[PDB]
Amino acid sequence: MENLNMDLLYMAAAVMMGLAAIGDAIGIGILGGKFLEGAARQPDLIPLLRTQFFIVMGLVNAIPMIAVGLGLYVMFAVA
Incomplete structure (x- = not known):
């Protein structure tokens, strides 16, 4: 099991x-x-805090998405 067990272990990691x-x-x-x-x-940072936020929103979901994203792609690559 070179691509049966490894998956398990990995899971523990990725997870x-x-x-x-x-x-x-x-x-x-x-x-x-x-x-x-x-x-x-500051009422002059309403559209700012929001702007910066929004981005941070997707980017925030990009951290994990890109994290597990790659990991997966790899897993499915060699497994």
């Missing part, structure tokens, strides 16, 4: 990664929300 990654990717995600009130200090 693990997704967690951590999610964490960070979240740190920002939640930040975007914790920024609203923050930027609230």
